[PDB]
Structure 1
């Protein structure tokens, strides 16, 4: 009874940086050709959503943020072939158009249809499906999941198993897949290796899960919040270090601990200094360091290229290197077959209406992932 009609529903609108979200009514247009309107069931609070609030991640405001989520298709536009009304789906913050040079490449996943490099805050057609107080509101990464309903381009949604528990598998839409793939796909962690993981939030814990799945012998968690260490050990860290406890820079500490440098290191925070420290602590001739964290907008790091000339490899990735539409259904199937766990990442559950409390929990250091239910 809503197909083809505007839907009025609640969403969390961000009108200004550094302010609480405003939970209020929005109007959601029906889907145009090759678009899908989704009734949201659950969405996680990822640090990247907070980066929009703080100005770390710049995208046009006002905006409906949220990108790690799962829901049920309410209606489809003309020409949609990959999902149908009633299907369970995960929106894809990195799309998979299937047609660009990146989608066609065996390794690449950062589809050229993304809205990250040159943010417009729109659908693929350059327009918005959201109105609030009569004003157009921007989308975020082609997802915008902090709303009871959203509209996404078909290349930004994947159909998943009809029996999936949406309050858990929403994490496959960003944080779990990112960390897990960063270890198993991007770094390609090897059996018996030593790994160092900087940042023990939801994404860093998922990196640990992937390093353990790959058979690493040592997994050193690094965080300035020692309250993060117990869960890190539960999911596979063999030891944890707090840089604030040491008189020496932690790259020196980690080099000593690993008898000359780690095999694989991961920056899962989003600071320029820890990106350079993480590179430095891998072994100078054969180490690999992967940047996962988001840097503050437009800022450059400084580093000595002799760190690379000796033989290190430095890389980064979005979404764990996974081609998003191909990979998300398979990761859900693997979760349903118990191949990895999501419960360790979920520390808090709240209704959507308590979104601001959910962001308070993240900012205070108390949560890993808070899941919001609609």
Structure 2
């Protein structure tokens, strides 16, 4: 009863920074050519969504945020070939156009069609499909999953197993895949190695899962919230340290614990100081450090380049280095074949209408992932 028509539905609109989401009626236009309209089933609350509220991540407002989700195709636009109505899908916050220089490179995944580097808050054609109170509303990362219905470009959606449990596999749309791939694909953690993981939220626990899958012998979790240590050890950490417990800088502590530096370190918080600390605690001649966390907008870090001249490697990645449309369906299939677990990341399940309580749980330190159900 909705194909080709405007849909009126519920969404969580962010009208301005540092305010609660406003749960109210929006209008969702039908998909144009090469676009897909999706009925949302589940969406996770990721720290990157909170970064929009806090001003840490700048994107045009007002906006419908949300990017870690799964749903069912309601209708498709002219020329769509990769999904059909009724299909289960995961929106892709990093597109895979398949035709740019990055998509064609064996090691690149940050497709040049992304809306992250110079955010416009639109669809690929530069316009918006959302209206609220008569006003146009921006999209977020080409996904906008905090809504009962969204419209995405075809290059930003992947079809997944029809038997998938959507309230779990939405995490493959961001948190799991990003952390897991940061360990197994970006860092390329080796068997028998020592790893250090800064930040033990949903992303950091997924990094730990990847370090353990890669055969690391030691995995040191680092967090200022000791309530995060129990779950980190359940998913593979061999020990946890709270920097606030020590009188010396944690890079010195980790270098001593590791008899000279760790093999792999990961910054999974989003602080400039912990990015430099994580680089410093990896072994000076052969260590590798990977930045996953998102730093505050337009702020530079300061570091001594001798940390690199001795032999260290420093890198970062979006979405765990995974080519999004190729990888998301394979990752769902791996989950269905029991190759990794997602339940350890899920601490809370709430109806979508309680989105603000879900953010309060994240901000208070009490949750890993809250999954919102529509």
SS of alignment partner, residue 120 of structure 2: coil
**Which consecutive segments of 4 or more residues in structure 1 shift more than 3 A?**
none
What is the 5 A alignment of 1:293-304? 293-304=293-304
Matched with 2:201 is 201
Q: Which residue of 2 aligns with 1:266?
A: 266
Q: Which runs of 5+ in 1 are unaligned?
A: none
TM-score, with structure 1 as normaliser: 1.00
Alignment-derived partner of residue 89 in structure 1: 89
User: Per-residue CA shift, 1:302-354, capped at 9, x if unaligned?
Assistant: 00000000000000000000000000000000000000000000000000000
Where does residue 341 of structure 1 map in the other structure?
A: 341
CA distance in 2, matches of 1:296, 1:372: 26
2:195 and 2:2 map into 1 onto residues whose CA distance is: 51
- Which sections of structure 2, spanning at least 5 residues, go unmatched? none
Q: 1:182, 1:34 → 2: CA distance?
A: 31
Match of 2:373 in 1: 373
Deviation, 1:188, is: 0.2
Deviation string 1:269-288 (CA, Å, 9 cap, x unpaired) is 00000000000000000000
Q: Distance in 2 between matches of 1:2 and 1:366?
A: 39
Structure 2 distance, partners of 1:298, 1:121, is: 18
In 1, distance between residues paired with 2:16 and 2:79? Answer: 36
SS at match of 2:25: strand
Counterpart Cα distance in 1 of 2:63 and 2:298: 20
Q: TM-score, normalised by structure 2?
A: 1.00
- The residue that corresponds to 1:231 in the other structure is 231
**SS of 2:127's equivalent?**
coil
What per-residue deviation string (whole Å, max 9, x for no partner) do you get for residues 99-129 of structure 1?
A: 0000000000000000000000000000000
**How far off is 1:135 after superposition?**
0.2
In structure 1, how many angstroms separate the alpha carbons of the residues matched to 2:357 and 2:337? Answer: 33
CA distance in 1 between counterparts of 2:288 and 2:303 reads 16
Cα displacement (A) at 1:69 = 0.1
Q: Return the alpha-carbon distance in structure 1 between the equivalents of residues 2 and 229 of structure 2.
A: 48
Shift of 1:290: 0.1
- Displacement of 1:21 in angstroms is 0.1
The one-character-per-residue Cα deviations of 1:195-253 (angstroms, maximum 9, x if unpaired) are: 00000000000000000000000000000000000000000000000000000000000
Partner of 2:330: 330
Q: CA deviation at 1:64?
A: 0.1
Q: State the alpha-carbon separation in 2 of the partners of residues 337 and 299 from structure 1.
A: 42
Distance in 2 separating the partners of 1:57 and 1:348: 25
Whole-angstrom distance in 2 between the partners of 1:157 and 1:93: 9
d(CA) in 2 for partners of 1:180, 1:97: 23
Q: How many residues align?
A: 374
Residues 244-267 of structure 1 show CA distances to partners (whole Å, capped at 9, x for unaligned) of 000000000000000000000000
User: CA RMSD for the aligned pairs?
Assistant: 0.2
Deviations 1:64-98 (CA, angstroms, capped at 9, x unpaired): 00000000000000000000000000000000000
